[PDB]
Amino acid sequence: MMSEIIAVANQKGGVGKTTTAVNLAASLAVHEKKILLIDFAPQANATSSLGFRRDKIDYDIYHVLIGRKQISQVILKTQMPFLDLVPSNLGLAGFEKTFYDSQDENKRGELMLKNALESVVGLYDYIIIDSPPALGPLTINSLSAAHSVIIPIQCEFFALEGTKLLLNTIRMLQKSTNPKLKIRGFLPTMHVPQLNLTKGVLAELFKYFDSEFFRDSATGEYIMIPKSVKLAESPSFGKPILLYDIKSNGSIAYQKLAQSILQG
Amino acid sequence: MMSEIIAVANQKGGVGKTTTAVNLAASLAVHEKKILLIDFAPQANATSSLGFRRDKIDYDIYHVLIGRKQISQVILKTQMPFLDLVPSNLGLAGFEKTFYDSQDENKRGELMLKNALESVVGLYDYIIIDSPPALGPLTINSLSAAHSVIIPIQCEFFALEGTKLLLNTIRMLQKSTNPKLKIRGFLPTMHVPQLNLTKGVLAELFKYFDSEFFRDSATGEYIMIPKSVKLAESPSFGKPILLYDIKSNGSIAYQKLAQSILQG
Amino acid sequence: MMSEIIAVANQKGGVGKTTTAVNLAASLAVHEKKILLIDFAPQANATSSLGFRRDKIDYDIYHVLIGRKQISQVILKTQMPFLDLVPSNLGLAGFEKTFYDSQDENKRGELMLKNALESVVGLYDYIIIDSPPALGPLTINSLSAAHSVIIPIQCEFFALEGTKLLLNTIRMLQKSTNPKLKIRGFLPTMHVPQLNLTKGVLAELFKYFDSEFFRDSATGEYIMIPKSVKLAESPSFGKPILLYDIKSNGSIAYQKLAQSILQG
Amino acid sequence: MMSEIIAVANQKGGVGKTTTAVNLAASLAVHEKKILLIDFAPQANATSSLGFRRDKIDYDIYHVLIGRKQISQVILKTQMPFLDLVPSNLGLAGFEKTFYDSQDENKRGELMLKNALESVVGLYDYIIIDSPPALGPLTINSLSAAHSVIIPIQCEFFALEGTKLLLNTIRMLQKSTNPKLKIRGFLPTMHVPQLNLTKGVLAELFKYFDSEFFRDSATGEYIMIPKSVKLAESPSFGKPILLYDIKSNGSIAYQKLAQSILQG
Amino acid sequence: MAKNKVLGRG
Amino acid sequence: MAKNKVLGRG
Amino acid sequence: MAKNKVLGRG
Amino acid sequence: KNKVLGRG
DNA sequence: TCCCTGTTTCACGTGGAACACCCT
DNA sequence: AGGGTGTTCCACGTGAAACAGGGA
Ligand SMILES: Nc1ncnc2c1ncn2[C@@H]1O[C@H](COP(=O)(O)OP(=O)(O)OP(=O)(O)O)[C@@H](O)[C@H]1O
Ligand SMILES: Nc1ncnc2c1ncn2[C@@H]1O[C@H](COP(=O)(O)OP(=O)(O)OP(=O)(O)O)[C@@H](O)[C@H]1O
Ligand SMILES: Nc1ncnc2c1ncn2[C@@H]1O[C@H](COP(=O)(O)OP(=O)(O)OP(=O)(O)O)[C@@H](O)[C@H]1O
Ligand SMILES: Nc1ncnc2c1ncn2[C@@H]1O[C@H](COP(=O)(O)OP(=O)(O)OP(=O)(O)O)[C@@H](O)[C@H]1O
Ligand SMILES: [Mg+2]
Ligand SMILES: [Mg+2]
Ligand SMILES: [Mg+2]
Ligand SMILES: [Mg+2]
């Protein structure tokens, strides 16, 4: 078999990409599945969330895209036995110059991550990519390297205009760069059910997107990550929520999302 | 006459940048000051906060930096008489190519926004610039166009590492491109004072940074923007908070902020 | 035919007796049925609700009970042609002395309303009796003279001990002075459904009493009279709610009550 | 030592007499005064408000007025050390008979509660009497027993005539039975200040009675008990509002009422 | 209208 | 509910 | 929304 | 046997 | 020191009632 | 001045999160 590569992408800032990418990778790993989490963002919050401070690690994902290293070396064992991390650092932001000069040659610049992942695809069950907040090069590499994509949606006004923008960026690559690219699902995040902004933003989303919302096998209802301050607390301890409070609602909801993704 | 150019910047996503930049610019126009809001982010949430959705933007901030348009040609008048807006677009993402092909020889590209403002700096009391979530060429341009910077701080764990990174980007520009750049302040945003994490993040911040946080120039208490869903609802109506709901917690906090700007 | 005599009774003060007795009598009279309302209370709030002043009335129901008048003379034509009133005043507080004297010859004294009603029962379709806040001689007469009995229930703690206590007074006479006597129905009054007190009081009442609650023919929803300050302001104008605001929720609810009583 | 005997009286049902008589007796008990609550109604809600179910009480208030038991032998200790209770029960409705066999010769049965009281009248700072919804023998007794009278006024239309009838009953007794009887004050209860009818009832009453309404001894504001479902939930736990919720508006109003009483 | 002698009334 | 020997509430 | 030329919104 | 401490 | 509890505090939605302009 | 609006203002229930001390 070979890895399903799941990109976690939304270009809106702070909708929960890193928390989703960190906790899904951890929830998938405790099912005895081999998981590679790639911190694909220059802010490097996924790396911090697993408790690797930036100056501990020599060489990062930027140095793999450059070709100084091959991805196999830069990989770290985490607290979890089944969770591996390609860490990031702010030096990864310097890939952006390297992008517009690598599309200047072979039109190969979108695929730099995808070609880098080729050595490691038979080595993992799932590869989870944490993308930064933009539709620029790093998110495009993340999307061109992926079989499927999770969309976190903070259910607030900017998500209406914003989600729509990402789909037609996705639709663009489905007819060009990565034709096999799938929407794995829509993942309501930071969810407070009672709010009239939250109901009305979800209503409008359910008009166009309802089939693609993450749903549960055993219930049949929607999978929604609740607003839980424990999830926000967890990266301060260098941990996924699973290793912080396993009983908490947000940990429960990430383990539900694990179970959907394993099922197919 | 001279405009004070203020940047609202943080590379962390979804921390209150746009909500500050729109509601500060409104709160200053309330006091009868002439205000230009520049939406400097490709996602263009500041423009959509004012009710200009874009099919209707003829030419925008991307066309000024080419020399394709002059800045007076793209300035739009809003509902607030003393507020004007320079709108933003998806086309602003292609400025990132324009920057990096000017660093090979000319190396002057960090000043592209500053020189676009030279035409309008005599005509405004305040020019408020809203920047995207990254430390790349959009933020850097605006941080080097700015006289001062306001840092919106969401009180969760990634603010700790992320702030010190942004200040190091500020110190680097203070020693090269923009020596006259000051920190106008740190504005806590989405504030929920009861949470231990909120207390915990502020304590580590006040340890190093306390002299830089916004204070009421009357009472001496900190100026923090509370978590209020009315500020989240307000851009859905194309309004700043003071037109939407002027008695709400967030509008008062944004008013108090403009008064702490208008003196020192 | 013959009159159905309905006692509207509760021992608890201020649960809405006079309001249901005034408004059911009017909601039955609008259907073009002949209706006599009897103010059986020394407070004479029913008389006050239909626009009669205590100095306008020459002789009252007390004068019928001692025998100084027969009931046919004491009867006043109200604002509606189908509603007649036997008025009261504070003179009826002198019946109680005349009760323990009139229980002291015979079995007589509990039946003095039954014996006064005999001359006018062929003359009305419905005769509605408004009872005072006590289980003493006036409520006893009212309950002994009647076929069916309405218990208004304010859904608040004292109704629990209270309605169980009145039911036992009912069942004593069902074994004794009036075996024909039945419970017409339970009428929730002053009803605000959101209250946890209201929810809990109606819950405890339901496991004992649900069959005896007034219900719609067209739906099967309970008939509950809402809190409507329009019902409170209506007797100040000398009017039933029907002649006052017929659109208002309390009027609609009393007309529902009329409607379901008419089917029996 | 001289106890000050206070009647809580209105013949209108459901206006707050028991709630007042219980919560004033409690609000005076926490000021370290010795307080005897005499629940003088057959319904006996004040007893039930203090969490005595009516199977517990061997001998009640009714057995004192007979001469069956002496007054000191029926007095219960409550959940507060400074409040004592003389309970009631359904057997108190048989007083009404006893009063009319006391006037077959003696005529003095209006003083039967006053004479029962003189044994405990040196042992108390305050004796609060709670009277039933009628102007009959129970209210008349407790009116001729008391030194003063607090009148609860639910501000709705029937408070207009009923107050005037109650003041006329009171002033009839200043002539004959109790010359020392004076109006301690009027307490608006169930108060909802925004209602036009509430405004309307108060305006007509203030026109005649304004100097008789309870005032705050500092601010000079009217003392009114707000509509609060906390005061209604409170007897379900067998507590006064003080032990139940001491910070709610109904409790503050009753404490404020006790301070005005405690002046003079 | 109404009997003269105005009373309450409607 | 703890006490309960005095009928009892609290 | 009731008078001027173009801009709406509304 | 986790050896020398980084992490925490 | 984990633990289960019940409580306290606070944002936010709900709905009745007043009210203020809008209708003619 | 009628029959609509939608806007404001209030009490009340709801649930997350902190924490209090009782768990032994
Ligand atoms: N369900 C949740 N409840 C409460 N807080 C959350 C939740 N999910 C994430 N967070 C917190 O919200 C913030 C934003 O989440 P996160 O950093 O995962 O977003 P992001 O999409 O990665 O942001 P960026 O665009 O900056 O990369 C973080 O501070 C995190 O601690
Ligand atoms: N105090 C607040 N309370 C509640 N919601 C808020 C508050 N401030 C901002 N928001 C909402 O929070 C979300 C994120 O805030 P905002 O979009 O201003 O952050 P940003 O930093 O501009 O995001 P980006 O990183 O995408 O530029 C928005 O959906 C906005 O409506
Ligand atoms: N559904 C209702 N909503 C609001 N107010 C009401 C309602 N029903 C009755 N009222 C008002 O409540 C008060 C008490 O009601 P009412 O006088 O009908 O009770 P009662 O049982 O007749 O009392 P009493 O024991 O004094 O005879 C009155 O002032 C009346 O105006
Ligand atoms: N200020 C208040 N706010 C809300 N509810 C109240 C208030 N005062 C009393 N109540 C509740 O209103 C109801 C009537 O009050 P209460 O029983 O004290 O009046 P009462 O005059 O004793 O009645 P009765 O005529 O039966 O003697 C009770 O169910 C009580 O719980
Ligand atoms: Mg992130
Ligand atoms: Mg923004
Ligand atoms: Mg009545
Ligand atoms: Mg009572």
Short mmCIF file of N, CA, C and O and ligand atoms in Angstrom, two decimals, chain A residues 12-13 154 156 158, chain B residues 12-19 43 45 133 190 225-228 231-232, ligand 2:
data_model
loop_
_atom_site.label_atom_id
_atom_site.label_comp_id
_atom_site.label_asym_id
_atom_site.label_seq_id
_atom_site.Cartn_x
_atom_site.Cartn_y
_atom_site.Cartn_z
N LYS A 12 -7.81 31.47 5.27
CA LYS A 12 -8.19 32.38 6.33
C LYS A 12 -7.30 32.09 7.51
O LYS A 12 -7.01 30.93 7.85
N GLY A 13 -6.84 33.15 8.15
CA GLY A 13 -6.05 32.99 9.32
C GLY A 13 -6.78 32.47 10.54
O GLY A 13 -7.93 32.84 10.77
N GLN A 154 -14.04 28.00 10.59
CA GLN A 154 -14.43 28.75 11.77
C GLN A 154 -15.75 29.34 11.33
O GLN A 154 -15.82 29.93 10.25
N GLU A 156 -18.02 31.76 10.97
CA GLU A 156 -18.11 33.22 11.18
C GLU A 156 -18.12 33.77 9.77
O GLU A 156 -17.94 32.99 8.84
N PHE A 158 -16.42 35.53 7.49
CA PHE A 158 -15.41 35.66 6.45
C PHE A 158 -15.19 34.34 5.74
O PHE A 158 -14.63 34.28 4.65
N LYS B 12 0.62 35.66 12.80
CA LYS B 12 -0.31 34.65 13.28
C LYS B 12 -1.65 34.96 12.68
O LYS B 12 -2.09 36.13 12.66
N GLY B 13 -2.29 33.93 12.15
CA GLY B 13 -3.59 34.13 11.60
C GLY B 13 -4.77 34.27 12.57
O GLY B 13 -4.81 33.63 13.64
N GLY B 14 -5.73 35.12 12.19
CA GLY B 14 -7.02 35.21 12.85
C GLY B 14 -6.99 35.78 14.24
O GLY B 14 -7.72 35.35 15.12
N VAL B 15 -6.11 36.75 14.44
CA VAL B 15 -5.91 37.42 15.72
C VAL B 15 -6.54 38.81 15.91
O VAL B 15 -6.30 39.45 16.92
N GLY B 16 -7.32 39.29 14.95
CA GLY B 16 -7.92 40.60 15.12
C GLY B 16 -7.37 41.76 14.31
O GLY B 16 -7.82 42.88 14.51
N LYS B 17 -6.42 41.50 13.41
CA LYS B 17 -5.83 42.48 12.48
C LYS B 17 -6.82 43.34 11.71
O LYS B 17 -6.78 44.55 11.81
N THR B 18 -7.67 42.69 10.92
CA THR B 18 -8.72 43.36 10.15
C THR B 18 -9.76 44.06 11.02
O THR B 18 -10.01 45.25 10.82
N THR B 19 -10.32 43.35 12.00
CA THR B 19 -11.24 43.91 12.99
C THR B 19 -10.68 45.14 13.74
O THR B 19 -11.41 46.10 13.98
N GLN B 43 -6.61 38.48 0.75
CA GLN B 43 -7.94 38.00 1.12
C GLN B 43 -8.99 39.10 1.15
O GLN B 43 -10.18 38.84 0.97
N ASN B 45 -10.37 41.16 3.55
CA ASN B 45 -11.44 41.19 4.52
C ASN B 45 -11.78 42.62 5.01
O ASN B 45 -12.89 42.86 5.47
N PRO B 133 -1.67 37.58 7.13
CA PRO B 133 -0.91 36.76 8.08
C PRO B 133 0.36 36.05 7.55
O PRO B 133 0.31 34.84 7.28
N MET B 190 -9.84 39.60 21.24
CA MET B 190 -10.69 38.45 21.60
C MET B 190 -10.53 38.07 23.06
O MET B 190 -10.53 36.88 23.40
N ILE B 225 -9.61 44.40 23.76
CA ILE B 225 -10.87 44.22 23.03
C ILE B 225 -11.48 42.89 23.43
O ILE B 225 -10.86 41.85 23.24
N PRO B 226 -12.69 42.92 24.03
CA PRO B 226 -13.28 41.70 24.60
C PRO B 226 -13.85 40.82 23.51
O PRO B 226 -14.10 41.29 22.41
N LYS B 227 -14.07 39.55 23.82
CA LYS B 227 -14.60 38.61 22.86
C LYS B 227 -16.07 38.95 22.83
O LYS B 227 -16.76 38.79 23.83
N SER B 228 -16.53 39.44 21.69
CA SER B 228 -17.89 39.92 21.51
C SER B 228 -18.31 39.49 20.14
O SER B 228 -17.70 39.92 19.18
N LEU B 231 -18.79 42.03 17.04
CA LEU B 231 -17.73 42.46 16.14
C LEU B 231 -17.56 41.45 15.02
O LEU B 231 -17.02 41.76 13.97
N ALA B 232 -17.98 40.23 15.27
CA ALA B 232 -17.90 39.21 14.27
C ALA B 232 -19.10 39.32 13.31
O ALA B 232 -19.01 39.00 12.12
N1 LIG K 2 -13.26 40.58 19.85
C1 LIG K 2 -13.77 39.74 18.91
N2 LIG K 2 -14.76 38.93 19.24
C2 LIG K 2 -15.28 38.04 18.37
N3 LIG K 2 -14.89 37.89 17.11
C3 LIG K 2 -13.91 38.67 16.65
C4 LIG K 2 -13.25 39.64 17.52
N4 LIG K 2 -12.31 40.23 16.76
C5 LIG K 2 -12.36 39.67 15.52
N5 LIG K 2 -13.33 38.75 15.46
C6 LIG K 2 -13.71 37.84 14.37
O1 LIG K 2 -12.60 36.95 14.48
C7 LIG K 2 -12.28 36.40 13.22
C8 LIG K 2 -10.81 36.51 12.97
O2 LIG K 2 -10.52 37.87 13.15
P1 LIG K 2 -9.89 38.71 11.93
O3 LIG K 2 -10.43 38.12 10.63
O4 LIG K 2 -9.94 40.20 12.21
O5 LIG K 2 -8.36 38.31 12.15
P2 LIG K 2 -7.23 38.65 11.10
O6 LIG K 2 -6.00 38.66 11.96
O7 LIG K 2 -7.54 39.82 10.22
O8 LIG K 2 -7.38 37.32 10.20
P3 LIG K 2 -6.35 36.96 8.99
O9 LIG K 2 -5.21 36.35 9.76
O10 LIG K 2 -7.17 36.05 8.10
O11 LIG K 2 -5.95 38.28 8.43
C9 LIG K 2 -13.15 37.13 12.19
O12 LIG K 2 -14.10 36.18 11.70
C10 LIG K 2 -13.76 38.32 12.93
O13 LIG K 2 -15.10 38.54 12.51
#
